[PDB]
Design a protein around this ligand. Structure first.
Ligand SMILES: [Zn+2]
Ligand SMILES: [Zn+2]
Lengths: 531, 531
């Protein structure tokens, strides 16, 4: 279904635009114009994707779910508009009177001076405030009874001609048809656009006729007449299914009415003082509503409240440009390569699994005797997503959310995805990654010692006479390409404790390269080399 | 980035709508109105998602790629519009003349009757066709030199007051500001909506002022004056950054101009005969363009050109409602359960792999000695997606496309996904599935015997004294739920050869249930029971 709606719109758009082009030049250079029927052509073009004819010469589900509901909604609504206008007119048909022979004479003169066909019907009523038409298979034409009396300024002459032109061209009907089609074609709002364009042009063609049948010195007053027919009426742009002088929802119209309504009034400044402040408070209330923290959309840029030194490790990053953060527990000092980049937030990928698993451990979901689903050491060493998918399913989401909040987990965005950190909604900077892991063991008072240590052992990479190096990689691979070269970890040495996070964005930003890069950096910096 | 743009729009929308509500009632019941500043409020609300402040009380990549490009595009464009209007005015400023004391007297009277502040500037020129303003930090006010001469109908009195009201309220500037903001805020088309609303209302408030400072019997002519200022001018709605009587792109405007242009002309009927047919041919050309075969979007509904009998197997489907097709090679007859449903097209899921693998065999990509990547029997028996993902990567896509075409593979839609049949773009009915597989072995003359037989052996399910039953399951599991219970296959018996396809849509439409259902049906129908 949706593809048709979509492509129907496409069809329309294309055609429409082509036509408009012609419209553009016909008018611009020659004051010529498209025969409006082309808009049917347009419609038809809009309709024809339908042909179930094989002619030639990603979760998409919602696309159709939406298309289906939107459409049915539109049609009942638009149908309602239709029947109301229809009824108005049909009911009005009941109220439509025949003309006196000495009234009929004028109307007939206007049209049949050109021997126009008589397959139309002329009626009048006191219930007609302004010229209006209907169809009923008869092309019902209606004029104000007051206009039948007021046949002394010949506005009516002009009006009828205008109305006639609509009639010659069967405009009433064309519109009716279009509106009906528009209802089913409503998925394309442009049905109204074109409806409108048509109307505009219908009137233009009418104007052409008018001019075609009048003198050069009448052209002027006609234009004035267009104006009189709007100036002198409320702009009750009511008949959405026909024509009337006031049939347009716009500015001049609004303004003129306000003058009609000019019984001078004063709003207590308080009326608007209240509304404006209230609203402002309501806008403030929108601000109170999750103002969409640009801070959260933005990659982290808060100043590291902690000291620190800026590093230059560009030689090691080399072919895989990125950023890197290291921290000394003894000195409470950070060492940061490309701080602007270090502060950038990226989805954690598989490295988050350490948090997921350790949360399961603290909450007594996952344990040592029952670290299995593989065990935790195997699962972590081989990144077994299955193991971890179950762990998320087995941990109350609120436990996880609580920890995200308590220990400042980046943007703490849990998304809606059970594995939201896996190239999805949760994002964290390298700086934040270091801060959080360090605090996880050093400060977290809502997390057991066993969970801290059990997790730690599963991450050992290498060791020597100075230290034990722990960590975890992950690769942000999307649609087969590398985007996030993650490696995180910590070092326990015989003199200090260090925390760190590496992220590659350029070159081949794989988790493996991040591991290699981090180790090389940490060694050169003394972390893995005794300083 | 995009989230801000999106949510900014949301902000706007909300606020806007709230305001409009008030607008609605203030006007509807009391003829009262929002102080336009609320639209700044709106803007601001639109702007504030920006606050990088954490205040409170799926391939998304494209979302931001798009947001980024769209925005930069919009701003250079809108900036261009701005500078042009600005320049027009600044250049015009160069052309703006001072008034004669005996001209100045009138302008000053109009404003300072109310002791309005004099921090404005009044100028004139022959280059002013209609009233217009600028800012320049001075609130430049411009009137036609002809209006300075034509100070005898007091239109100018009315105009200035109108202009003044804009000035009292610093409208020129407000607009300027908005437009500038609108440029950066352009991602929200509603900036123009509100711009416009503001303008509309700016004029309304001006009208309020006018009325506030005039008599009841002047109100009328003012309205007439609004009209005169539009009636008597080309609607060159040019100054997108200011106000003028003609400053609106609409219908009445277009019509009136055409009258000005009324040097009667006739388009050779051919002008439009050509354009209309050409266009029609262009619409036909759009029809020539992939008319989006609704036939292709639609599930298969072509009549089975072959005979057939309709079945009732609803008892077996039972808890898992669906459809089923069986075919007799000897009789060239089909047996169909719920034909309307049998004809429905579904993505093949893993059952397509038989085609993928056999294509690799014929094209000499995959073979017997080298059926491995697992071998083919293991890969097929355990549905090893990895095996099959590589097979698609290793087969020229055109080979596959050729076979889709030659043997009528449903909608033959290869999508863009290397595994397009795996709950993606390729879809086939059960009827089509039977037709295609049967033809694959029976008719396909662009496919070797070895590929046909090698594939066949890998599908054996069960056998007895009457037959060998072959087939393949697959489960349309999406976001963890079952949607497509596939099982396809064929039977080689000692009396006939049969082909079939089962699909479940309701209950638990798993591949396993489809296997069980198919076998049970085939046995009851005599296929797997000697008849
Ligand atoms: Zn009309
Ligand atoms: Zn104005």
């Amino acid at each position: 279904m949706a593809k048709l709606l979509i492509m129907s719109i496409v069809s329309f758009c294309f055609i429409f635009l082509l036509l408009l082009f012609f419209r553009y030049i016909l008018k611009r250079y020659f004051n010529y114009m498209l025969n409006y029927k082309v808009w049917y052509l347009t419609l038809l073009a809009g309709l024809i994707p339908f042909i179930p004819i094989k002619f030639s010469l990603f979760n998409w589900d919602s696309i159709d779910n939406i298309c289906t509901v939107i459409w049915i909604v539109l049609v009942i609504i638009l149908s309602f508009k239709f029947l109301k206008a229809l009824l108005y007119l049909k009911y009005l048909k009941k109220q439509s009177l025949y003309l006196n022979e000495n009234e009929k004479n004028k109307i007939d003169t206007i049209l049949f001076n050109h021997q126009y066909k008589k397959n139309i019907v002329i009626r009048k009523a006191e219930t007609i405030q302004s010229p209006i038409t209907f169809w009923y298979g008869k092309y019902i034409i209606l004029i104000p009874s007051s206009y039948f009396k007021s046949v002394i300024d010949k506005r009516l002459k002009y009006i009828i001609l205008h109305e006639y032109a609509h009639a010659k061209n069967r405009d009433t009907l064309h519109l009716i048809i279009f509106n009906i089609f528009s209802i089913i074609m409503s998925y394309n709002p442009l049905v109204h656009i074109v409806k409108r364009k048509i109307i505009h042009d219908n009137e233009v063609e009418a104007d052409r006729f008018v001019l075609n049948n009048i003198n050069k010195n009448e052209f002027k007053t006609y234009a004035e007449s267009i104006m009189d027919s709007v100036l002198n009426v409320p702009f009750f742009n009511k008949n959405i299914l026909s024509h009337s002088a006031n049939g347009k929802k716009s500015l001049l119209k609004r303004r003129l009415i306000n003058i009609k309504e000019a019984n001078l009034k004063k709003q207590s400044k308080l009326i608007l003082i209240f509304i404006c402040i209230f609203t402002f408070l309501l806008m403030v209330i929108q601000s109170q509503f999750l103002m969409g923290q640009s801070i959260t959309d933005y990659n982290y840029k808060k100043p590291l409240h902690n000291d620190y030194q800026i590093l230059d490790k560009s030689k090691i990053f080399g072919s895989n440009s990125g950023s890197f953060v290291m921290y000394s527990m003894k000195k409470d000092k950070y060492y940061i390569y490309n701080e602007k980049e270090s502060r950038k937030r990226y989805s954690p990928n598989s490295t988050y699994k350490i948090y997921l698993a350790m949360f399961g451990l603290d909450r007594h979901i996952i344990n040592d005797e029952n670290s299995r689903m593989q065990d935790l050491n195997t699962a972590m060493q081989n990144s077994v997503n299955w193991y971890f998918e179950r762990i998320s399913d087995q941990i109350p989401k609120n436990y996880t959310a609580t920890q995200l909040k308590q220990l400042n987990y980046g943007n703490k965005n849990l998304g809606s995805y059970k594995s939201y950190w896996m190239e999805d909604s949760l994002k964290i900077s390298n700086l934040e990654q270091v801060i959080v892991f360090k605090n996880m063991m050093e400060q977290n008072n809502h997390f057991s010692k066993k969970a801290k240590n059990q997790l730690s052992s599963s991450l050992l990479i290498k060791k020597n006479e100075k230290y034990e190096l722990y960590g975890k990689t992950g690769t942000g691979i999307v649609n087969g390409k590398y985007n996030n070269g993650w490696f995180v970890g910590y070092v326990i040495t015989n003199h200090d404790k260090y925390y760190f996070a590496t992220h590659l964005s350029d070159g081949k930003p794989s988790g493996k390269n991040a591991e290699l890069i981090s180790e090389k950096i940490l060694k050169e910096m003394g972390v893995l080399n005794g300083q």
